[PDB]
Amino acid sequence: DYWDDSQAFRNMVYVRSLAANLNSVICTGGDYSFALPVGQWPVMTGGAVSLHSAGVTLSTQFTDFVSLNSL
Amino acid sequence: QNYGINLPITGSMDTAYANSTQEETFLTSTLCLYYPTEAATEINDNSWKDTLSQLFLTKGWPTGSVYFKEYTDIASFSVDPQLYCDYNVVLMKYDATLQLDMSELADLILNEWLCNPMDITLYYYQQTDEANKWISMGSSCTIKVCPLNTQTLGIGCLTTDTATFEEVATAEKLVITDVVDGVNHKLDVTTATCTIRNCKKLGPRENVAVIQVGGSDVLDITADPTTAPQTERMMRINWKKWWQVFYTVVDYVNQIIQAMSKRSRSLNSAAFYYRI
Amino acid sequence: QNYGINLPITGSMDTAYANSTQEETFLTSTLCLYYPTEAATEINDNSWKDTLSQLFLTKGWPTGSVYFKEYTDIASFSVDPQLYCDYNVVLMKYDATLQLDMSELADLILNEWLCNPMDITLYYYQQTDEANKWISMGSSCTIKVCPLNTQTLGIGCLTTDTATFEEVATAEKLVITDVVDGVNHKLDVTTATCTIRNCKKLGPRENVAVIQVGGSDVLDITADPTTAPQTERMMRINWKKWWQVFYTVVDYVNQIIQAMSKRSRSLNSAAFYYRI
Amino acid sequence: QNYGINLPITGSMDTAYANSTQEETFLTSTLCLYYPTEAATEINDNSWKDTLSQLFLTKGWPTGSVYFKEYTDIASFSVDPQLYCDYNVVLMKYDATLQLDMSELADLILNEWLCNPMDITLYYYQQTDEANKWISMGSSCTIKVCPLNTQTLGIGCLTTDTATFEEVATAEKLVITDVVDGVNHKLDVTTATCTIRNCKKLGPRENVAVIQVGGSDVLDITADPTTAPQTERMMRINWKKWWQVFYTVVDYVNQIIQAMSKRSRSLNSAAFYYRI
Amino acid sequence: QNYGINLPITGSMDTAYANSTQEETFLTSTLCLYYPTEAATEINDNSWKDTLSQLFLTKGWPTGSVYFKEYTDIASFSVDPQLYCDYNVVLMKYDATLQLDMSELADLILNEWLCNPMDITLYYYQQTDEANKWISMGSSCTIKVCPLNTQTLGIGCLTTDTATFEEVATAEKLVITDVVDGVNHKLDVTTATCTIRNCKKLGPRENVAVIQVGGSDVLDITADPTTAPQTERMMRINWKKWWQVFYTVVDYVNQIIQAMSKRSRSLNSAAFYYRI
Numbered sequence A: 001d002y003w004d005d006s007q008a009f010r011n012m013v014y015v016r017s018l019a020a021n022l023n024s025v026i027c028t029g030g031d032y033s034f035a036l037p038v039g040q041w042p043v044m045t046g047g048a049v050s051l052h053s054a055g056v057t058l059s060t061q062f063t064d065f066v067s068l069n070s071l
Numbered sequence B, C, D, E: 001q002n003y004g005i006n007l008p009i010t011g012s013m014d015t016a017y018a019n020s021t022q023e024e025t026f027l028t029s030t031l032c033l034y035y036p037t038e039a040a041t042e043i044n045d046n047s048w049k050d051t052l053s054q055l056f057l058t059k060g061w062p063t064g065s066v067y068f069k070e071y072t073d074i075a076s077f078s079v080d081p082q083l084y085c086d087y088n089v090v091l092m093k094y095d096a097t098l099q100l101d102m103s104e105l106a107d108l109i110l111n112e113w114l115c116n117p118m119d120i121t122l123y124y125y126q127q128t129d130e131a132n133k134w135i136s137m138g139s140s141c142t143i144k145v146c147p148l149n150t151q152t153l154g155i156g157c158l159t160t161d162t163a164t165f166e167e168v169a170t171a172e173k174l175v176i177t178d179v180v181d182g183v184n185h186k187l188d189v190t191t192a193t194c195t196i197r198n199c200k201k202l203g204p205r206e207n208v209a210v211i212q213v214g215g216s217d218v219l220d221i222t223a224d225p226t227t228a229p230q231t232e233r234m235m236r237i238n239w240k241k242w243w244q245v246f247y248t249v250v251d252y253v254n255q256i257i258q259a260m261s262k263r264s265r266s267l268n269s270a271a272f273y274y275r276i
């Protein structure tokens, strides 16, 4: 969910005819090591998922500082 | 002149013809012969320009009137062609694989064009009229077109993913794109190498005549499929040696110029009139 | 209402011009585009038909009026082509090796043909007049002909011995044979994989247009050597990309339809003349 | 003609009759005999077609005007029947168990039809007028119909569950479906085995005559229950041997064709005009 | 509509002045400002262009109509500068050491020059009339001229030895050469490094104005020693801060444009005179 300081988000409370285009990307999994007390250290390495665009809607980001009306 | 452009001109249908102005036209005009580099290579002579000038003088052109400009090939010459003098004769070598490129060069140099900048990275563009086209030229043009809907998103192409755009040109030194009128298009162009302009065809160009050396009638200077006009300035000849071609051009220079008209030359040699 | 008779129609030379009917024609008529498979392969887009329908809608064709029919190649498409739409546009790619095949295809689809059966086993066949041809279609047509004389004996051929027959077609998907008129001929045809029909060229097929994508003008829809007419329905376009070809077709659909007329044989007035 | 179709034709009741046109009609026409395979099987001769041609020639038909098109049986012949000659005489063998199929075949080939494609997977279809029917033909056609209501909900069936639909045709080579007019129907058909078209009966054919070999008068070429019009083109004969049937057809070809009229053969050999 | 014919105009007095067209021209025209890079360096703001656009909008120019073009220095800008806006204002910094160069630049952009090619390797050249000059431009021009006599022999020079020629330019990026008229000159120019053209001064260029920043009146746009015309398009401003210069330019844009006129050549009336 994305929010911006542009005029398109300043008073976004009601939205219609919402449409979007998004190009796919790839999220590749990195290496995470486990701090075992003794012996060899296992590592979780690899793992990739290609993200492809799907339907867009309206959401709200609720953080400790700002409550934002986002897409 | 200009204030009286929108005024009638009346003429009697019995006014005596004036004498031939061909001699005066030659004495006060300059002629350009654009030929491919392979022509000079095959001729294999370093004084052939002087011989051609002397032959033209035998044909009435004063020494200094005729000029010779060399271009590597159709693809290179199509990158912002420059038409320098009053009468331009372009000797275009025919290749069956480059029919569209020959047609595009002929369209560019045989017609007047009124071009404007296209900031494809900021605005999406339309072709309002049948005369409106998109002429792009440079080192290498690759134009990808994404038609857009009322929401300004893409139709059959993601507005962001250029891989889903529609390819109309690839590594082209010149291309004249014609998309459906009235539809906004997002354009992805290799702006680093070549420039694209929104152009309007104003009318014919009388000072430029293209002689197609070999081949058949393949030029189509109009995007309309129903029309493939063969104007008087689009000549075609059959060749085995370039010296014969040049002798034919010199001998029938009167006929070639007759197919061309004066006053069509512009101060600048550019192939279009640029507005920004 | 009066269908089986030809009644003269009288008109005044000054009545009026009715308003443009192009919009109504587009609203109430269907369009068909026939293109080769390689066009779809090069486009390599799944929803390109939807985009073309959207563009046609921008040009005033209601959604669903335009249809896109694929064919593998000229030879395959020539096997009993069926053009059922109100307006048919056939994009035919030019192959310098298949000039006669393209000519035969265009002659078959650009003209109107009244065909009767041929049973080569029982009967010997003549061609009565200049409009009489023998059109054979199938997966593989091989036609050999033996011309007879007034005594029914073959000329340069033996009726019993088919090996002496004169081959005029070999492994053809479509062929329009033209032999000397007034001479009986014994025919040997591969009836298993090819059907031959005795056809008469009534006249032009108004609602079918052929756009040649590629080389020069090579089509000859007339068996007469002295004439090679280029009708307004025989368009020709130079190309490098298929998306450009389809954009040109859509942008100038008004002119393409203007070059075509409703099939005179497909409206009620033709009732009890031949069809509808 | 089209511009004078809606013009009166006036005739004087004293105009002298023209001479018999039967001779000239035969000398310029083609005759097609459609017979079952069992006919040729019982005849058991390879030159019988030649003998029938000679016998017809004794009756005034030039050698080359009579053609014989064999069909396996009524059901197979009912799949897109093709009528090739100017005059078509179809010999249908009567079977007590196939009265409806005989009636459907006669209706298809004794009447002109105007048909359109039916994308039954996307849209619901109605029958506007008593002349509107749904003609479906193919290798095996099974039609299931669910009538809807004003709210677009099935009546006596579930619009989503085909198992509740109503059976109107099971494994039919050809079937003409008549449903209640003005009611939207959801259709499911074996589209992989047959094609279904929305067709309109225009009128009689006048160039197809169906001779029923054996049985009684069972044909019903009109869906209206209160009409079984026995037109002049639907004949009936009794038989014990096929040679007698063919001799009767040859000897009375004058009467057979006097009941038919030329000018009705379509340019296409199909049994229905098609529009997409 | 009547292009290429000089029709007289017969206006009268007491026709009443039309309202001010300044607002409409600002709405429908574009403005280009040409300034040196040191201007942007001294301003030291990344959004100064936007602020100047906003100020021009306060003066009536629609946003996006004013373009800000930048050039390194005078020599770099003298490399065939292109001025394509409807109105062009060139902020040219004064340098006592580049006076002639300054003048040359002005002479090139404050006047209309019909230029035709020059092939020094092949022809000898002479200047026919006082309006004829030789304009050479490029990375570096070094022109050496050998005057000839009626015996085509060099005067104070040898036609074969270019070391005896007379130097008129050295390392120039733009130079306008004026030689004695009616005398043929042999030319030695660094054609590889720069190009020379035979140019006739048609008249003033009205859409281009030059504002000389600091200095004194030193410009001489005419080769005539007896004339040093300071036209209304040659402004001079004393300066200390470039921000003041740009504020003065924007504030008095009305006066600056009033000192200029639409390019007489670049408009529809000049069709078939030189352009558009």
Ligand SMILES: *[C@@H]1O[C@H](CO)[C@@H](O)[C@H](O)[C@H]1NC(C)=O
Binding pocket: B019
């Ligand atoms: C035109 O040609 C005629 C005939 O040769 C000659 O007398 C005349 O001087 C020429 N010039 C003009 C201006 O008529």
Ligand SMILES: *[C@@H]1O[C@H](CO)[C@@H](O)[C@H](O)[C@H]1NC(C)=O
Binding pocket: C019
């Ligand atoms: C035809 O066009 C004219 C001009 O707009 C209009 O007045 C008229 O109603 C239109 N229709 C007919 C049937 O004339």
Ligand SMILES: *[C@@H]1O[C@H](CO)[C@@H](O)[C@H](O)[C@H]1NC(C)=O
Binding pocket: D019
């Ligand atoms: C019609 O038949 C009559 C009677 O035999 C004959 O005299 C005449 O020539 C025939 N033809 C015409 C055109 O009357």
Ligand SMILES: *[C@@H]1O[C@H](CO)[C@@H](O)[C@H](O)[C@H]1NC(C)=O
Binding pocket: E019
């Ligand atoms: C011209 O200016 C006057 C006064 O400023 C104004 O009334 C008038 O409408 C303007 N336009 C014309 C066409 O006179």
Ligand SMILES: [Ca+2]
Binding pocket: B100, B101, B104, B172, B173, B174, B175
């Ligand atoms: Ca090209």
Ligand SMILES: [Ca+2]
Binding pocket: B156, B157, B158, B164, B165, B166, C045
């Ligand atoms: Ca796409």
Ligand SMILES: [Ca+2]
Binding pocket: B127, B129, B130, B132, B178, B179, B180, B181, C251
């Ligand atoms: Ca267009």
Ligand SMILES: [Ca+2]
Binding pocket: B220, B221, B222, B223, B224, B225, B226, B227, B228, C236, C237
């Ligand atoms: Ca064309």
Ligand SMILES: [Ca+2]
Binding pocket: C156, C157, C163, C164, C165, C166
């Ligand atoms: Ca032989």
Ligand SMILES: [Ca+2]
Binding pocket: C100, C101, C104, C172, C173, C174, C175, C176
């Ligand atoms: Ca063939």
Ligand SMILES: [Ca+2]
Binding pocket: C127, C129, C130, C132, C178, C179, C180, C181
């Ligand atoms: Ca013939």
Ligand SMILES: [Ca+2]
Binding pocket: C220, C221, C222, C223, C224, C225, C226, C227, C228, C229
């Ligand atoms: Ca021909």
Ligand SMILES: [Ca+2]
Binding pocket: D100, D101, D104, D172, D173, D174, D175
């Ligand atoms: Ca049935």
Ligand SMILES: [Ca+2]
Binding pocket: D156, D157, D158, D164, D165, D166
């Ligand atoms: Ca049920």
Ligand SMILES: [Ca+2]
Binding pocket: D127, D129, D130, D132, D178, D179, D180, D181
């Ligand atoms: Ca019904």
Ligand SMILES: [Ca+2]
Binding pocket: D220, D221, D222, D223, D224, D225, D226, D227, D228
């Ligand atoms: Ca009935």
